[PDB]
Amino acid sequence: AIERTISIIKPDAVGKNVIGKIYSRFEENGLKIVAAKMKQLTLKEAQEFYAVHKDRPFYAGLVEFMTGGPVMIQVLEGENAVLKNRELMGATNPTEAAEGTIRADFATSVSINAVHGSDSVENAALEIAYFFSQTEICPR
Amino acid sequence: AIERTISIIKPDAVGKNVIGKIYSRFEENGLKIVAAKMKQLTLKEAQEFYAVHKDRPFYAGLVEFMTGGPVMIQVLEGENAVLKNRELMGATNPTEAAEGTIRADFATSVSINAVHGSDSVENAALEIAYFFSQTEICPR
């Protein structure tokens, strides 16, 4: 079944200017970019988007990281898109990420890890609606 | 001088899912993406953006082609950004386009030519202002 999921290219990978390499990792693996925008997240936006982590020690650092520079946000469409996005992303620890994943290639550390992707069908709907209106999605 | 120019990945290249490979052409040559959005152009938008060609024979076809599917629009930043973008795009006719250029690798014909870029600094300011507010630009 065809799904839609959010991807965020974090300020580290934007700062490395590897947006295109990451985009090609999706495009060459059966996912299509159907919405996209570059954005400077506010503190409130980073805090709300990651509110699920608000009581964890890494939260303050994560919000600082995610507001420290611009991000590239896109909706990816394709079969099994939620789990396929996460497979292409790889494990958060770059040492453990499988060869050929985005984090294997571009992540600095388990915290500075290049990409976010929605982790479930429900979470993809919420995250897409957080950053996009439906009218911002462009069917092919 | 550190300029800003507009780039459009046209619906042919978007439909081919080579947004990433085109972005890498910009990024791997020093250009930085400082604003970006995927958009479905309206008839009026394509007509106004290309109004300089309204009296030319290819005007009607150019408008149809640019509205047949979504485009990817981005502002590229870097020294000599206007000319550098045009160098990376290559000649309009893919037969005359140099090896390794965008049109040499991704353009279909002189009319289905994969990419647009501003032709002058003054036209770059107008074209950027047409599709983006200044608040949508994300300096690094």
Curated annotation (Swiss-Prot), chains A, B:
<comment type="subunit">
    <text>Homotetramer.</text>
</comment>
<dbReference type="Pfam" id="PF00334">
    <property type="entry name" value="NDK"/>
</dbReference>
<dbReference type="InterPro" id="IPR001564">
    <property type="entry name" value="Nucleoside_diP_kinase"/>
</dbReference>
<dbReference type="GO" id="GO:0004550">
    <property type="term" value="F:nucleoside diphosphate kinase activity"/>
</dbReference>
<dbReference type="GO" id="GO:0046872">
    <property type="term" value="F:metal ion binding"/>
</dbReference>
<dbReference type="InterPro" id="IPR036850">
    <property type="entry name" value="NDK-like_dom_sf"/>
</dbReference>
<keyword id="KW-0808">Transferase</keyword>
<keyword id="KW-0546">Nucleotide metabolism</keyword>
<dbReference type="InterPro" id="IPR023005">
    <property type="entry name" value="Nucleoside_diP_kinase_AS"/>
</dbReference>
<dbReference type="GO" id="GO:0006241">
    <property type="term" value="P:CTP biosynthetic process"/>
</dbReference>
<feature type="binding site">
    <location>
        <position position="86"/>
    </location>
    <ligand>
        <name>ATP</name>
    </ligand>
</feature>
<comment type="similarity">
    <text>Belongs to the NDK family.</text>
</comment>
<feature type="binding site">
    <location>
        <position position="92"/>
    </location>
    <ligand>
        <name>ATP</name>
    </ligand>
</feature>
<dbReference type="InterPro" id="IPR034907">
    <property type="entry name" value="NDK-like_dom"/>
</dbReference>
<feature type="binding site">
    <location>
        <position position="113"/>
    </location>
    <ligand>
        <name>ATP</name>
    </ligand>
</feature>
<keyword id="KW-0597">Phosphoprotein</keyword>
<feature type="binding site">
    <location>
        <position position="103"/>
    </location>
    <ligand>
        <name>ATP</name>
    </ligand>
</feature>
<protein>
    <recommendedName>
        <fullName>Nucleoside diphosphate kinase</fullName>
        <ecNumber>2.7.4.6</ecNumber>
    </recommendedName>
</protein>
<keyword id="KW-0963">Cytoplasm</keyword>
<comment type="function">
    <text>Major role in the synthesis of nucleoside triphosphates other than ATP. The ATP gamma phosphate is transferred to the NDP beta phosphate via a ping-pong mechanism, using a phosphorylated active-site intermediate.</text>
</comment>
<keyword id="KW-0067">ATP-binding</keyword>
<feature type="binding site">
    <location>
        <position position="10"/>
    </location>
    <ligand>
        <name>ATP</name>
    </ligand>
</feature>
<keyword id="KW-0460">Magnesium</keyword>
<dbReference type="GO" id="GO:0005737">
    <property type="term" value="C:cytoplasm"/>
</dbReference>
<dbReference type="GO" id="GO:0005524">
    <property type="term" value="F:ATP binding"/>
</dbReference>
<keyword id="KW-0479">Metal-binding</keyword>
<dbReference type="GO" id="GO:0006183">
    <property type="term" value="P:GTP biosynthetic process"/>
</dbReference>
<keyword id="KW-0418">Kinase</keyword>
<feature type="binding site">
    <location>
        <position position="58"/>
    </location>
    <ligand>
        <name>ATP</name>
    </ligand>
</feature>
<feature type="active site" description="Pros-phosphohistidine intermediate">
    <location>
        <position position="116"/>
    </location>
</feature>
<dbReference type="GO" id="GO:0006228">
    <property type="term" value="P:UTP biosynthetic process"/>
</dbReference>
<keyword id="KW-0547">Nucleotide-binding</keyword>
